[PDB]
Amino acid sequence: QVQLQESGGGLVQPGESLRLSCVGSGSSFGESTLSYYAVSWVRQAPGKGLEWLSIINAGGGDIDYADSVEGRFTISRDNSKETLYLQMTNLRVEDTGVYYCAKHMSMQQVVSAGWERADLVGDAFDVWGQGTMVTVSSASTKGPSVFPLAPSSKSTSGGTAALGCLVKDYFPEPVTVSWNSGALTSGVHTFPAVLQSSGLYSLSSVVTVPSSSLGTQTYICNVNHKPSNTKVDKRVEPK
Amino acid sequence: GIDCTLIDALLGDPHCDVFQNETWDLFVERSKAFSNCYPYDVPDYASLRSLVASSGTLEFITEGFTWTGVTQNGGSNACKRGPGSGFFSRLNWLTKSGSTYPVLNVTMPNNDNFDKLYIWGVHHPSTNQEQTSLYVQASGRVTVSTRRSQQTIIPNIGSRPWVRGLSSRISIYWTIVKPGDVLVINSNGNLIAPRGYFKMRTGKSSIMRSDAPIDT
Amino acid sequence: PNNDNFDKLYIWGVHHPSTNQEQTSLYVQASGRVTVSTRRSQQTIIPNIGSRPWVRGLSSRISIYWTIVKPGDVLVINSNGNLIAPRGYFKMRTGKSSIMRSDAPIDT
Amino acid sequence: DIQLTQSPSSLSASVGDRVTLTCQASQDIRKFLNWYQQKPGKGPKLLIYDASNLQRGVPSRFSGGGSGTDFTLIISSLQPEDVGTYYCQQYDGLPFTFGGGTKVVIKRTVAAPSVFIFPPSDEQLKSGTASVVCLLNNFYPREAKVQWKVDNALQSGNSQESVTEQDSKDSTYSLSSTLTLSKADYEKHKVYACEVTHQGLSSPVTKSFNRGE
Ligand SMILES: *[C@@H]1O[C@H](CO)[C@@H](O[C@@H]2O[C@H](CO)[C@@H](O[C@@H]3O[C@H](CO[C@H]4O[C@H](CO)[C@@H](O)[C@H](O)[C@@H]4O)[C@@H](O)[C@H](O)[C@@H]3O)[C@H](O)[C@H]2NC(C)=O)[C@H](O)[C@H]1NC(C)=O
Ligand SMILES: *[C@@H]1O[C@H](CO)[C@@H](O[C@@H]2O[C@H](CO)[C@@H](O[C@@H]3O[C@H](CO[C@H]4O[C@H](CO)[C@@H](O)[C@H](O)[C@@H]4O)[C@@H](O)[C@H](O)[C@@H]3O)[C@H](O)[C@H]2NC(C)=O)[C@H](O)[C@H]1NC(C)=O
């Protein structure tokens, strides 16, 4: 199957511009790649549903826009790079949210055959990217401080021990957290961020691990906050 | 004919579509004629050209073929019609719908009192990737027949010389159906379908190659 | 490509093996294909496996085809097995030449 | 713009239950309707296209039906991994629009939380602020009360809770409560305690620690 990955999101002032990209990889039937399909941009404001923004056909035509962004956003694609773009201008606070590029399922063109579907189908979004976060705000980016949540003697509950990372005082959303570079996944919970009175976000990630395996093993959390270029690895050890 | 050969007018190359439904006693082909659509060849080109020239008309009657479970009206940037991709006006490029291309099996009786000329084709993809993307089947087949005739063509995948962006090809075939006879088209991929038929006539019509101007 | 100002005649062929053994032994592919084309012509031949009458030890055959390429045109040969390839081309001429079948001796 | 109305807003059901989600269009959209599943913090995934077709790779317990204005997505046997939000989406005409979503929530057997408390780290105190963390792990139902006590004094207004989305495998929740106070205040007192009240505990459970031990 074709796979999608968006990028370019970050924090920007109202009125500024920003260019999102989306790269297709993998392949579908007949070794088709993204440049064989029509694609849309769809966005999702915090805590809200999904909003379609714009569509572009495989060959670059049949462009259309939702009213909320018509005249500000421009969709385009470079099929030689299997890449889609969304150029946003005159951004406003309500443009804040996660942006997905999403492939429509029906084949629209086959270049090696000189074939192009007569019509733009625009049927179901069979592949979505993981999304990219756009925040339109006056406040400047701040990177997280990462502190260990340390397991202690007498902390055992059930037959298990718990340890974690407190990712505190950052803006804007989001931060990603992994454990041992992704080698540790079972029993991990990364909590939703909470907005503090300071106007900065805070989040905790925890993992429950057998007591024994703890003595014997090394647990490190990797925190990424792209808008501030933060990449922290924090080792977590008992007090 | 100006910029068009008689065969390009027949198929409906967009820059030749001015000639739709035209008639002639003598069709004059110019050395400056050119094709500007999907690259094609015609086995027995000379015969098709001859029989059409002799028929002396391009009168075309669309028929309501039903193509169940396929996508119709395929087009190409090798054959632009106005600003967008397009295709021969008289042919209908069928491709898969969803993830399948069924065995097409359609019939069209001749209940008229004249002969019908059907022009159809078979697509030869340049690659297996192409073959399957369009038609799902790894190898296609087109069989067109009447009550006493049959022609079966197996598409053949591989590269030909790059023409207007394309290394693939269409091969054009034709079938005449007499009054009281019937056409059956059976295909599991690679069919370039007819949209209808040309009405056959007999008479004094012919074709000539000349660059001489035409006076009053 | 033909960048000369005369027509080139290419003679080529397609091998027909007598068995599947042969086919795969020579060409690896279970069924071959030969496609030779110019900018306005094409010929594609699929070899056909099976025995023909034994000739000079052989039940297989080669089929011979030809392609003419005009000035400014180009030859493309595309195959995944069974191609009997040309080594070059014959220069085409026009003129008074012909051929005759005869057993008459040639005198001075 | 075609409006899609999904009901109910939220639906609770037990593992194994046959579940029906509904979508109503403000106009006849024939069968041009798709259903997606979106798990929290993840992109949507296609389940059903053109009202009734199961997308390749989607578990067969999903089925779709309807046409015109009334559509249904049916999960023949709810699995815990089915928790999340489901959207219907229409492509009869531009602009493409989505329903407001239906959240699926599992009803399960009570499961009592395991509770852990963490003191603030040395790196953090070192900065004039103290965050004390309480974790409630893998419990059901979601409703829980977390009460902070400092030297036995009931705290209020200086803590915040966050709750994970219902888990896709066992349908439980986890919760964190963070008590924030200045380094000065944190150093005033000695005993820090998290008291959890929850339907799966017969009486409140307290986890605590003594500062600097
Ligand atoms: C099988 O072999 C074939 C022969 O090598 C390959 O066909 C070639 O495909 C290439 C790559 O796309 C074509 O390159 C294009 O050529 C056009 C035209 O070039 C000519 O005209 C331009 C403009 O007048 C001029 O600049 C050149 O010098 C040429 O005179 C270019 O405009 C494009 O940019 C592009 O490069 C070849 O034209 C084509 N050759 C032939 C003879 O068909 C084919 O790719 C091979 N297939 C596989 C699967 O490998
Ligand atoms: C498919 O059927 C074919 C027909 O039966 C088979 O072809 C036969 O293959 C055999 C075995 O290799 C050949 O036998 C050879 O014959 C030659 C020539 O014999 C003739 O000339 C010699 C010399 O003048 C003379 O002695 C004979 O009487 C004949 O006049 C022999 O020299 C060899 O030693 C050998 O015996 C047949 O010739 C051939 N028949 C034909 C009509 O081609 C084929 O083998 C079968 N295939 C399979 C897969 O079994």
Summed up, what is this model?
It is classed as viral protein/immune system. The structure is cut from a larger assembly and holds one copy of chain A (239 residues), two copies of chain B and one copy of chain D (213 residues). Chain B has 216 residues and is mainly β.
What does the oligomeric state look like here?
part of a larger assembly
- Beta-strand proportion of chain B: 35-45%
The SS-based structural class of chain D is mainly beta
Describe the main β-sheet of chain B briefly.
Answer: 8 strands, mixed
Our count of helices of chain B gives 3
Radius of gyration of chain B: 17 Å
Count of helix runs of chain D: 2
Query: How would you describe the shape of chain D?
Result: elongated
How much strand content do the residues of chain D show? over 45%
Q: Estimate nothing, just give the exact number of structural domains of chain B.
A: 1
- Give the number of domains of chain D: 2
Helix-strand string of chain B:
HEEHEEEEEEEHEEEEEEE
| End-to-end distance of chain B | 17 Å
Helix residue percentage of chain D: under 10%
Structural class of chain B: mainly beta
Hetero groups bound? a molecule of 4 linked components (NAG-NAG-BMA-MAN)
How many distinct beta strands of chain B? 16
CATH superfamily of the largest domain in chain D: Immunoglobulins
PDB class: viral protein/immune system
Keywords: viral fusion protein, immunoglobulin, virus attachment and entry, immune recognition, VIRAL PROTEIN-IMMUNE SYSTEM complex
Entry title: Crystal structure of broadly neutralizing antibody C05 bound to H3 influenza hemagglutinin
Chain A: Broadly neutralizing antibody C05, heavy chain
Topology:
The structure is cut from a larger assembly and holds one copy of chain A (239 residues), two copies of chain B and one copy of chain D (213 residues).
Chain A (H helix, E strand, L loop, with lengths): L1 E6 L3 E2 L5 E9 L10 E8 L6 E6 L7 E2 L7 E6 L4 E6 L8 E11 L1 E2 L4 E2 L8 E4 L3 E5 L8 E5 L10 E11 L5 E4 L8 E3 L3 E2 L5 E10 H6 L2 E7 L4 E7 L3
Chain B lengths: L5 H6 L14 E4 L10 E2 L3 H11 L4 E3 L7 E5 L1 E6 L2 E3 L4 E6 L7 E6 L6 E9 L3 H8 L5 E5 L4 E4 L15 E9 L4 E8 L1 E4 L1 E4 L6 E4 L7
Parallel strand pairs in B: 1-16, 2-12
Antiparallel strand pairs in B: 3-15, 4-7, 5-6, 7-14, 8-13, 9-12, 9-14, 9-15, 10-11, 10-13
Chain D lengths: L3 E4 L2 E5 L4 E7 L7 E6 L6 E5 L3 E2 L7 E6 L2 E6 L8 E7 L6 E2 L3 E6 L6 E5 L3 H4 L3 E11 L4 E7 L2 E2 L4 E5 L9 E10 H6 L2 E8 L6 E6 L3
Parallel strand pairs in D: 2-11
Antiparallel strand pairs in D: 1-3, 3-8, 4-5, 4-9, 5-6, 7-8, 9-10, 9-11, 12-13, 13-17, 14-15, 14-18, 16-17, 18-19
Bound molecules: a molecule of 4 linked components (NAG-NAG-BMA-MAN) (2 copies).
The site of a molecule of 4 linked components (NAG-NAG-BMA-MAN) has 3 residues of chain B, from loops.
PDB class: viral protein/immune system
Keywords: immune recognition, VIRAL PROTEIN-IMMUNE SYSTEM complex
Entry title: Crystal structure of broadly neutralizing antibody C05 bound to H3 influenza hemagglutinin
